[PDB]
Design a protein around this ligand. Structure first.
Ligand SMILES: [Cu+2]
Ligand SMILES: [Cu+2]
Ligand SMILES: [Cu+2]
Ligand SMILES: [Cu+2]
Lengths: 324, 321
């Protein structure tokens, strides 16, 4: 409800200055040395190393990642009111024309142009990062199948996760629209189906032992989230997706739909989180890789710490699905 | 080892089965709707009882496809008939063969409008409703149906029925899947769909009854759901079996279940839900299937359809083997 910061619809004319502030922060982070954890690519690699896909940690990990990166964009933009505008793809089933302007477009020549240059710039920092990992961080890497930083590079190079200049997205300014399947995935009918569940797991995707495992998926993850990623193409179709600035507009919308669901559950007098014995299993999952606006590792390193918007202190301009 | 063989619909040896299928469709469109093997009576089994978004997905569909295969076998007069499968991984488009004659639900042999559909099916479906057992009425209540008119409300208002010219969105000239659906049927997605080593992760989430929604496995959420929706018209809603291609689609889904089961057996891992989950899954009532004699079937729990069993078919191997 009452909050200091406001995540606006990116089509809101009042959001236009925040998109300029975002451009300023991207330009800064592309120009930070990759020894700085707020370097644009260092930021993307948090997602490669730690993001949950296909499990009940999906919305809560993304709340933490987006909430920390918002503070970093706020700091480096010099815009003390900054909050991430959301992409309401239900209203706008296309890459926003605004995200083809300047450094919101990852084809912009300010971005690293090739895998060769990316590895040249990021290999020494990522090796130094690996060598600094705690016992607990190396266990998370083992859970994810990474025995060394070169396992991370194998997945980047071979997937591929990095896309060269001209291929940073499949969708273009001239042809920005979703295909029929992705239009149905973001449709108001699908959004209502996504919000309909009355238990956290059915809403938020399946229970697993650790957040690097795959389980069954909820509608929110499997339809609008996954199909928007894949339809955009390029970085957005794989685990270096936060290289594309539109990633945070996408996740601002996902987090808004979580906020909608939570308030709907509260209205029905139903639980807002996993219940009984599931709650501590879900809350105690280690999230060990988030970076604050000072470039330092964050203290709050359990999933449970990110269950509520809490100290991130934002709310949303209401968007698609609010009336549920 | 099996008596019947579900072939790839691109196999030259499947071409006679596509003609037999056309003959059975023509017959079932011309059966009175008092006959439970009438084409529309058959589609309504799916509207009344199909699970979507839970662990009963593959097993209910095995039962429905297996019974309807026997009905097509009987009414075609082809004693070797088995449903050819649509390997959309190999053929990411509506097969050109499914735009020929009554394989195309735009064919004028089909009922052309909702008004005629209701006129033909309302009295039979009302008589059917009034014949339901306490147990069948409980399944209807689980699904939110207190009356046959709740079923018609869902048909009319969704809508589930599509008029002549709109029976599919994809056409003979433009039969191809969009980029998202091509990815959903891609070999990479098929391998991901087969990768799970537990039934629930493979076959979608546990629920208390089969009319409830849960989390979904890759098999259901990507290739199954996206092919339905990309085709459009009948295939995007719960009168989907009105489109003959429904059974070619479900022959491929059932093949991928067979592939998964044999992969599990090779790894020495479970082929079904385990422990306390197994009886919950096996004992779910499936009370609406119709035999090739037009009679209600005796095998009326999910557990009866866990194996191919006396349906007695195997597959020509396809994508993901
Ligand atoms: Cu992610
Ligand atoms: Cu994402
Ligand atoms: Cu179905
Ligand atoms: Cu289906």
């Amino acid at each position: 409800q009452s909050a200091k910061y406001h995540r606006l619809n990116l089509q809101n004319p009042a959001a236009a200055p925040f998109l300029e502030s975002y451009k300023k922060a991207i330009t800064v982070m592309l120009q930070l040395p990759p020894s700085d954890a707020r370097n644009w690519y260092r930021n993307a690699f948090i997602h490669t190393l730690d993001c949950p896909h296909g499990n009940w940690w999906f919305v809560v990990w993304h709340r933490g990642y987006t909430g920390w990166f918002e503070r970093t964009v706020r700091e480096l933009s010099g815009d003390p009111n900054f909050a991430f505008p959301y992409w309401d793809w239900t209203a706008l089933p296309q890459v926003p024309d605004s995200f083809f302007n300047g450094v919101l477009d990852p084809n912009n020549p300010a971005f690293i142009a090739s895998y060769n240059e990316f590895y040249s710039q990021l290999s020494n920092p990522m090796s130094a990062l690996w060598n600094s990992f705690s016992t607990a961080q190396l266990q998370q890497m083992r859970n994810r199948g990474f025995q060394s930083v070169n396992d991370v590079w194998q997945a980047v190079r071979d997937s591929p996760m990095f896309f060269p200049r001209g291929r940073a997205r499949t969708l273009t300014r001239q042809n920005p629209g979703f295909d029929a399947t992705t239009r149905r995935a973001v449709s108001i009918g699908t959004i209502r189906n996504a919000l309909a569940p009355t238990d956290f797991i059915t809403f938020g995707s399946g229970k697993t032992a650790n957040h690097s495992e795959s389980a069954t998926q909820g509608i929110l993850e499997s339809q609008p989230h996954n199909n928007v990623h894949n339809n955009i193409g390029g970085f957005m179709q794989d685990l270096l997706s936060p290289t594309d600035p539109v990633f945070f507009a996408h996740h601002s919308n996902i987090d808004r739909l979580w906020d909608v669901w939570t308030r709907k559950q509260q209205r029905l007098g139903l639980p807002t989180l996993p219940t009984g014995a599931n709650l501590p299993l879900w809350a105690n999952e280690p999230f060990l890789f988030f970076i604050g606006p000072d470039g330092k590792p964050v203290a709050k390193n359990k999933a449970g710490d990110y269950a509520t918007i809490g100290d991130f202190d934002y709310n949303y301009e209401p968007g698609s699905g609010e009336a549920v």
